[PDB]
Amino acid sequence: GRYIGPVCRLCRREGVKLYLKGERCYSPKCAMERRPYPPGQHGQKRARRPSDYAVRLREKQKLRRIYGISERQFRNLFEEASKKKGVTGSVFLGLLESRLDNVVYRLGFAVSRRQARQLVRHGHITVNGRRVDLPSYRVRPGDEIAVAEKSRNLELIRQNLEAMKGRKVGPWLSLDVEGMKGKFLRLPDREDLALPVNEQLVIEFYSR
Amino acid sequence: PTINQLVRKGREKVRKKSKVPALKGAPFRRGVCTVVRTVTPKKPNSALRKVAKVRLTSGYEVTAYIPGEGHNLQEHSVVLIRGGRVKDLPGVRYHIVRGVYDAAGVKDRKKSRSKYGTKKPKEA
Amino acid sequence: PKKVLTGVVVSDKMQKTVTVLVERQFPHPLYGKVIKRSKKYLAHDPEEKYKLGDVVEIIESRPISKRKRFRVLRLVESGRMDLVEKYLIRRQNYQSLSKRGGKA
Amino acid sequence: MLTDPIADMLTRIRNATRVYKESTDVPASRFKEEILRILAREGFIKGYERVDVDGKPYLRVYLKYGPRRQGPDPRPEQVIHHIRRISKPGRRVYVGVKEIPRVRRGLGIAILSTSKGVLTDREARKLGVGGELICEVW
Amino acid sequence: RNLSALKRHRQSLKRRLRNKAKKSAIKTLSKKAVQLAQEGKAEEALKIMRKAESLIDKAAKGSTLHKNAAARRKSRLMRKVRQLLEAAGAPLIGGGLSA
Amino acid sequence: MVKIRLARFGSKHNPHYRIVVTDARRKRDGKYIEKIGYYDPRKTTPDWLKVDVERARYWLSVGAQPTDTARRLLRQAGVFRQE
RNA sequence: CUAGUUGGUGGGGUAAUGGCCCACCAAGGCGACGACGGGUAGCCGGUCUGAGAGGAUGGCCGGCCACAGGGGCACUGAGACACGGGCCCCACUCCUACGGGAGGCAGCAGUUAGGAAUCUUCCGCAAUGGGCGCAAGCCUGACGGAGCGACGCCGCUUGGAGGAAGAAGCCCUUCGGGGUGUAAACUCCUGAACCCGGGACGAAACCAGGGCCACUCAUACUGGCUCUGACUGACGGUACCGGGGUAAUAGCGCCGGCCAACUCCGUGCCAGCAGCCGCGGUAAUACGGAGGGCGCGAGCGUUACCCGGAUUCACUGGGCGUAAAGGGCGUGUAGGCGGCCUGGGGCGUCCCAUGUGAAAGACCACGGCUCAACCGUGGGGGAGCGUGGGAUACGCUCAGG
């Protein structure tokens, strides 16, 4: 079971904003607002010069907690992105962004990555018609990711797809807010993501 | 060594020697207590380390440490040995597994209970 | 193909049989240098033809006796004890290196 | 005795260049001359020429160096930074055309001796052949 | 218990006996002949040899001698016989003997 | 006796046979003499039965005796149609 | 170390060569290039690790061998020295009217003993395949399945959004306050479990009626094609589809350094921790609890063992003045190595073709299960060795100088 526990506390430990809640993580309350110091009895105390490990560790934990994924699954993606041709760093990020549950989030259906995970899980999602309830499902280029008809009437889905009016979409995506459809055009490139991550250190961490 | 020498005598592969003849190269061995003495430390350290002579099913008669604040081991108590020496007690090469057979777990152990085999206390 | 080999007759001490000393070469499987080993075959010599010192071609045959599966196909070059010597001299060092020691 | 003529030559060369000799003699042998041919062509030595020392045949090897330098130790960079014997008596080394090494990522060479003559690793690969791996230069 | 295919053993014993009986006849005649050639008596030495030859080939008919087992027997026989007959023999009947 | 038969190679509930030329005595999933086709019982794909009729005919050419089901598949790929 | 020992001649036996076996003759065979003896081993495609070289490994699956309570033996057969066939001996078990009889799971399942430890006395012959039969069909603990045991791998579950300058409890405090913490409470949505309905692939042959071909004198056999053709599922009413529907297993290790994670309290060289260095004798980030934190998540941690780190046996890839390491010196055997020129040979060496290198695995590509793990198809690379052809610089050999 992927984490499930206080989350704005991770935002804090990474001393960087993490959108693990979609909304609110804007309204002066992501906590990273007037309280960006780590959680716990020591948060306010001065921080010491981190060790090379600490740095590589913290960097990976970030990139990972961003997609609310287990180390177990995370690692396998990485070792997969290591074998396949091309700059491991980005190739890795490509695969992370190809998770059906991520895409859903990326396409505005869900407000957060967690929410999207559930929508996919509870069947409210489609992939070329056939429904898919596997969050780890890998979306390929040229796949329509529509909202389940039976759910198209769901209060939740109508709100999000509403506010989704106007909101642009990643250059590797595209969506028809009408039939609540969207397409995975291509694998995003490192540039396409504004991730507060340095895969450089993530690769190095799995080097040790 | 010359190449021709290497061809003649060649390199000798290193052999490691066990540090735990718990025989059968087993993970654990059960034995019977004989003496529940109490040795004294070495070089600097000082105290009353609780030890126990054990007659293993492996045919060996050994000395084993008894971890924990307080134990309940006696003369003929059945026990399980897990291997692991004790830096201060020359001659003790294995620890006794607490929570198995006759060795009761440590009472009032609220932390590293996995070791000291003590069940989870029910928080009132 | 019935295997054919070439060696020297290092022994004519038996009846209708001779000891051919076939030499062989090859690269050491790990250190690569070309090493050179050798083996003795007892070959069938009916005519009692072949003599000590002869270079002969041995041919894989049907068993003739236990420890004897080769027949002297033919003679390649007669007389040349320079080879028998090595073989004998080597047998001679054996005459020691035990509780005493081999000459020089 | 002179155990390895080829190795003797690479060393004479390594030795002379380290002190910046202009020339440098090495007893002549068809084979050694064959090697020098490559050394020149690959531009490692100004060139070489037959000569007679004390009546016996030798090969003058005209050494080549970089230009003078700045700061302390104005000694020129060597053109022959390296030059090591590989196949050696009592440890011969032969390679198939698929095993011909790629010296210094291509910036260096390797002189082989093939049944097609003495060639450099590139030449050998072209002619698709292998053979005793004489040396390595870069 | 009871693996009714005991029958196999049951039959093995018969066959064993049937074979055993063919061979002993074979050996007896073989010597019989060799010994006649031995003593130089041409005619009867061959006469018997032919029987031996026959029994042998018949033994190879079913699975008694079978194979080259039969061949070996015949050759070792006709050989021994013709040679021993070199005592002023002159193979009369020349039965099992291509003169 | 040499046969032409099926060899279970699928997985639980996902059977996939291999029309094979083996000796009657081997495990059904043992070492065969040659592969000459494959068969997907559940036609999970448009290509659920290849047969290389060329080879089959060769094996039959010399005693290969097909299991019934094997023959029925060989017939489908017209190994017998003699038109 | 060894006399059937090494060879020979004649002979036996075999499908067949052969001291395989025998008679006679000769005077042998093996070893330091390790005979003989002792120990260990079932061996192998592969597997784990490793940058590689290499190291370790060979259980599951496939190939070979060996054994069948232990030892020996043959019969019958195409084939056995024959797990569920036979004979004798071995001790043991059982029946005995005490003379004498009967037995032998290293097959599936199961029992018992031993052990830290290893399953159902299950379903089925439907599928694969196998034995007999013309066929119908019979047999099939092989097999196909279900069951027990995160024992391993893979997948998933144990909610989502909002929600205070921030409840209470608990912890710390410079007593101002800080922390647990949007966490909770609560609101709304979502809705695993669970309920209701539908309900599968795997099965098409073998073989109900009709039509037709090949062979044939035949409308007698035999074989085939085809059509409308029919029967058959253990798993299982399971997967899956549709509708309804509840916020609803966690956890485990660690926070002195190596090593990511610190405060209070208790304890007082005690009780305890401990992989190493070490920690505890009144301020302990090292013992016990708590708060907080770090890691990972039916997972987490320990023990054991292998490699990695360990270039710590060094071929890749190390060394020997003083750190461990030159034998005290010579003479020389075997062996390793080889001045200049020419010619022959082509053994090493290099090239080409060809054969073999199994399958599985590894690599790349595409494909199947919602992904993946897993699996399918295809392709490429690959040492080594056999065969034919070729080259001749170097090494070797021969001849000459």
Side-chain angles (χ1 to χ4, degrees):
Chain A
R2 299 306 152 68
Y3 188 37
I4 293 175
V7 178
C8 264
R9 82 192 304 301
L10 311 177
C11 266
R12 300 216 285 135
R13 164 58 65 198
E14 254 58 39
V16 175
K17 223 175 190 184
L18 288 175
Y19 299 143
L20 304 170
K21 271 185 180 181
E23 184 170 300
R24 159 161 260 215
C25 266
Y26 298 79
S27 62
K29 307 175 182 182
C30 186
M32 283 313 276
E33 227 63 87
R34 302 176 177 181
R35 209 191 193 199
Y37 53 109
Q41 166 171 148
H42 304 287
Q44 294 176 61
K45 297 180 173 175
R46 159 199 153 183
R48 300 196 178 191
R49 185 267 291 191
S51 52
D52 291 47
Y53 184 69
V55 177
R56 272 75 169 162
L57 189 279
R58 301 321 318 171
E59 198 69 334
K60 180 199 75 67
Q61 289 297 270
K62 190 191 298 176
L63 189 278
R64 163 159 146 288
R65 287 168 173 179
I66 279 180
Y67 299 70
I69 265 184
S70 63
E71 172 69 4
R72 187 64 162 192
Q73 283 206 305
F74 190 97
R75 190 68 193 292
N76 299 312
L77 258 185
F78 178 78
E79 292 297 345
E80 183 173 6
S82 300
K83 302 173 189 171
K84 311 195 73 179
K85 292 187 170 184
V87 176
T88 295
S90 52
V91 172
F92 181 32
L93 287 166
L95 275 41
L96 270 182
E97 219 74 46
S98 303
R99 291 175 64 70
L100 179 63
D101 73 323
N102 171 69
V103 181
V104 165
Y105 164 83
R106 275 272 185 268
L107 285 187
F109 297 177
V111 158
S112 67
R113 288 222 165 61
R114 292 193 157 192
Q115 199 182 90
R117 196 193 180 78
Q118 197 175 65
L119 283 157
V120 169
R121 250 284 106 181
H122 293 337
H124 315 310
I125 297 296
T126 266
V127 168
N128 307 337
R130 291 80 185 189
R131 79 154 169 285
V132 175
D133 56 292
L134 306 163
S136 59
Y137 181 89
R138 177 174 302 173
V139 183
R140 303 182 192 178
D143 283 333
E144 300 190 307
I145 301 186
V147 171
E149 311 65 77
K150 294 60 183 180
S151 312
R152 287 194 253 198
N153 300 293
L154 286 181
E155 187 206 78
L156 212 199
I157 299 179
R158 289 205 178 185
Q159 294 185 55
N160 307 321
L161 263 151
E162 161 69 16
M164 262 306 284
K165 290 176 177 176
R167 277 179 158 181
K168 286 184 173 179
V169 151
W172 74 95
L173 296 180
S174 70
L175 87 179
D176 172 294
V177 197
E178 314 291 59
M180 307 159 123
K181 312 191 175 193
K183 282 191 177 184
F184 191 76
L185 310 182
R186 184 53 219 177
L187 282 172
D189 203 309
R190 171 45 172 163
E191 282 70 295
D192 297 287
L193 304 304
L195 275 159
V197 175
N198 187 186
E199 66 275 38
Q200 252 292 292
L201 311 181
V202 172
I203 296 178
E204 291 185 351
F205 170 98
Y206 284 140
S207 297
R208 194 169 190 296
Chain B
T2 77
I3 270 296
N4 184 59
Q5 288 182 318
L6 279 174
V7 177
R8 280 196 291 124
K9 307 177 181 180
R11 301 299 187 175
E12 148 181 49
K13 293 286 96 65
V14 179
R15 288 178 181 170
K16 299 178 181 182
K17 297 174 181 176
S18 168
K19 291 187 185 178
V20 171
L23 195 70
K24 284 191 179 183
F28 303 100
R29 191 102 301 186
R30 75 149 179 176
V32 185
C33 281
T34 298
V35 195
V36 176
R37 186 186 298 83
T38 286
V39 191
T40 68
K42 160 190 163 62
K43 295 187 170 187
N45 287 176
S46 174
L48 289 174
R49 259 107 226 209
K50 285 62 183 175
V51 193
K53 295 299 178 190
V54 180
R55 188 83 49 173
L56 287 338
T57 48
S58 61
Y60 295 59
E61 296 70 43
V62 303
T63 288
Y65 192 82
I66 307 172
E69 286 294 9
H71 79 267
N72 69 300
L73 303 170
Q74 287 171 45
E75 272 208 60
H76 317 313
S77 21
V78 169
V79 71
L80 187 69
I81 280 175
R82 78 166 169 54
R85 311 211 180 189
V86 182
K87 204 65 177 181
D88 296 341
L89 305 176
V92 209
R93 299 184 176 185
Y94 323 77
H95 277 52
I96 273 175
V97 163
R98 302 217 49 174
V100 175
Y101 298 138
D102 292 340
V106 184
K107 302 169 190 167
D108 292 336
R109 239 294 165 165
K110 308 172 72 186
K111 301 241 180 180
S112 305
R113 311 200 315 283
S114 181
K115 337 191 178 188
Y116 311 125
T118 69
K119 312 284 179 177
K120 177 92 172 195
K122 6 58 201 172
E123 45 191 296
Chain C
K2 286 185 177 54
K3 184 76 178 174
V4 184
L5 298 166
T6 310
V8 197
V9 180
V10 307
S11 166
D12 187 355
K13 293 188 172 186
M14 298 182 280
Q15 298 172 177
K16 297 196 187 67
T17 324
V18 287
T19 306
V20 181
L21 172 55
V22 175
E23 218 159 308
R24 169 171 67 98
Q25 309 201 317
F26 66 86
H28 189 285
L30 177 61
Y31 304 125
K33 86 123 55 179
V34 172
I35 75 186
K36 173 213 306 181
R37 235 100 301 238
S38 69
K39 170 177 183 180
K40 297 185 300 184
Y41 298 83
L42 298 189
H44 191 41
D45 181 11
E47 302 171 294
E48 285 278 39
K49 188 160 195 164
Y50 311 87
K51 299 186 178 181
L52 197 47
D54 278 311
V55 163
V56 302
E57 284 202 321
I58 290 314
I59 213 295
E60 180 180 358
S61 314
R62 168 237 308 169
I64 299 165
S65 69
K66 162 194 186 184
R67 167 139 216 292
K68 188 164 172 189
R69 282 61 184 163
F70 285 99
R71 296 183 296 162
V72 185
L73 204 192
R74 67 181 189 72
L75 188 168
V76 173
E77 68 153 297
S78 188
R80 59 167 303 162
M81 316 297 285
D82 67 301
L83 287 180
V84 178
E85 285 316 305
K86 287 182 190 162
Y87 172 70
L88 291 175
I89 284 179
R90 208 189 319 157
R91 186 204 301 174
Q92 212 162 310
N93 297 327
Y94 287 27
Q95 193 273 306
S96 43
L97 38 54
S98 59
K99 285 182 192 291
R100 282 295 69 176
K103 267 297 156 296
Chain D
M1 182 195 273
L2 232 181
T3 176
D4 185 328
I6 298 302
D8 185 67
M9 176 181 73
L10 311 185
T11 293
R12 296 209 172 199
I13 294 173
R14 186 187 315 100
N15 289 331
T17 64
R18 268 50 191 167
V19 277
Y20 298 91
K21 317 304 254 59
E22 204 178 60
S23 179
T24 173
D25 299 21
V26 358
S29 76
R30 278 285 187 194
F31 187 37
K32 263 180 280 184
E33 184 166 40
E34 282 302 341
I35 304 182
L36 292 171
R37 246 197 195 182
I38 290 65
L39 277 316
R41 194 186 309 131
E42 289 306 314
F44 283 117
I45 59 174
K46 287 207 184 73
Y48 76 91
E49 62 168 304
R50 292 175 161 179
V51 157
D52 264 51
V53 160
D54 183 62
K56 290 70 178 181
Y58 280 66
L59 303 178
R60 279 290 167 61
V61 182
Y62 292 99
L63 279 31
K64 177 171 171 184
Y65 313 83
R68 184 160 180 297
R69 297 189 301 157
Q70 304 299 315
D73 188 0
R75 272 183 299 176
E77 172 180 322
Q78 301 281 327
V79 184
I80 291 189
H81 305 65
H82 190 79
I83 179 175
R84 195 240 294 201
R85 240 240 122 144
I86 290 174
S87 178
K88 329 204 203 67
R91 230 299 207 192
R92 242 69 211 201
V93 167
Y94 316 100
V95 294
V97 58
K98 308 163 182 285
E99 304 172 295
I100 310 175
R102 271 181 176 175
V103 194
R104 252 275 198 297
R105 240 59 166 55
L107 310 190
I109 77 158
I111 300 188
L112 313 209
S113 177
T114 69
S115 66
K116 269 194 174 188
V118 170
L119 342 168
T120 78
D121 52 322
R122 292 187 175 172
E123 288 169 30
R125 215 159 316 197
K126 176 175 185 172
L127 291 284
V129 300
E132 193 162 310
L133 214 175
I134 294 151
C135 64
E136 160 197 73
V137 183
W138 48 256
Chain E
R1 312 169 201 155
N2 296 297
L3 192 303
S4 278
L6 296 90
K7 179 182 183 173
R8 272 296 193 183
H9 185 292
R10 214 186 292 153
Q11 313 172 303
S12 74
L13 293 174
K14 301 186 189 172
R15 295 181 160 275
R16 168 172 163 296
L17 183 35
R18 200 120 47 183
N19 283 321
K20 168 198 168 187
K22 296 224 178 185
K23 277 178 295 198
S24 37
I26 295 182
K27 302 169 183 175
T28 297
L29 284 198
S30 301
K31 311 174 191 170
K32 221 291 198 60
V34 165
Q35 221 294 150
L36 281 197
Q38 206 314 311
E39 312 177 67
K41 302 194 191 57
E43 260 200 302
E44 56 187 313
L46 294 173
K47 273 177 183 176
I48 295 175
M49 187 218 271
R50 300 110 132 306
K51 288 181 187 177
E53 176 170 4
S54 178
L55 302 192
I56 296 185
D57 269 315
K58 293 188 167 188
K61 205 62 209 177
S63 66
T64 296
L65 259 193
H66 245 13
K67 323 258 180 180
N68 328 314
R72 288 206 324 276
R73 310 264 180 157
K74 298 163 66 179
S75 40
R76 289 173 179 171
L77 212 207
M78 289 170 72
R79 224 138 201 173
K80 291 163 196 167
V81 173
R82 177 180 288 208
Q83 316 188 341
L84 282 138
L85 276 166
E86 306 310 24
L92 301 180
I93 301 173
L97 279 193
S98 157
Chain F
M1 177 203 71
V2 38
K3 288 211 200 168
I4 300 180
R5 73 201 191 198
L6 282 52
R8 247 268 189 163
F9 263 97
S11 59
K12 217 203 264 176
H13 298 310
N14 188 44
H16 281 72
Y17 306 70
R18 285 194 187 179
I19 292 172
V20 147
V21 173
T22 185
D23 174 295
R25 305 167 286 189
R26 283 223 188 277
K27 307 181 173 44
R28 78 151 140 65
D29 291 353
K31 171 169 73 181
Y32 39 91
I33 305 156
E34 181 184 323
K35 187 183 190 182
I36 56 177
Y38 62 79
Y39 161 52
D40 178 3
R42 308 182 305 159
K43 319 95 173 177
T44 61
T45 67
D47 180 6
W48 56 269
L49 178 69
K50 170 187 157 295
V51 180
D52 168 43
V53 332
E54 175 44 55
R55 289 262 77 200
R57 293 167 180 265
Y58 166 71
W59 279 113
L60 299 155
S61 161
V62 234
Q65 215 72 48
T67 295
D68 274 326
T69 302
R71 171 183 265 115
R72 162 218 164 190
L73 297 185
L74 293 197
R75 195 178 299 297
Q76 277 200 49
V79 183
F80 307 105
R81 163 175 280 112
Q82 48 193 325
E83 305 302 304

